[PDB]
């Protein structure tokens, strides 16, 4: 109970299950994270954008593969 | 091994083993200390 919300020390000191619930729901609110600067904010958003586009392309590739393999195209 | 055996090899693997190991890792991580 001292290292899940790495981005928030206030949550990491919560002795209740609320820490786990709030750790999920505040993970992407980068502006509210501990030890936060603007440069790190924009860089993390940039990397998250890259990962997101990768996820989209992987989803499309999966649709294509499953139509090619198990479909009747 | 034919291609039609891949569903029976993978669906149990993913849908049961991956939850087990993922739960183990996530529980261990969220129950850590400092």
């Amino acid at each position: 109970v001292y290292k899940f919300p790495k981005f928030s020390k206030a949550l990491a000191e919560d002795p209740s299950t609320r820490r786990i619930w709030y750790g999920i729901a505040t993970a992407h609110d980068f502006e509210s994270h501990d030890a936060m600067t603007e440069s790190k904010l924009y860089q993390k958003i940039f990397a998250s954008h890259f990962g997101h586009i990768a996820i989209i392309f992987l989803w499309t590739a999966g649709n294509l593969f499953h139509v090619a393999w198990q479909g009747n195209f | 091994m034919s291609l039609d055996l891949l569903p029976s090899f993978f669906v149990p693997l993913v849908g049961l083993v991956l939850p087990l190991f993922s739960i183990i890792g996530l529980f261990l991580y969220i129950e850590k200390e400092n």
Binding site: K3, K6, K44, A47, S48, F50, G51, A54, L58, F65, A68, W69 | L3, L6
Partner: peptide, 30 residues
């Protein structure tokens, strides 16, 4: 109908994309 070689190498390439994903995941820190 695609062959075993076609599916196998796609699985291998998918593994490589997985190792690249954890490297990005670990680089975005714990």
């Amino acid at each position: 109908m695609i062959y075993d070689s076609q599916v196998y190498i796609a699985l291998v390439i998918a593994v490589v994309a997985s190792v690249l994903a954890i490297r990005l995941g670990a680089t975005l820190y714990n």
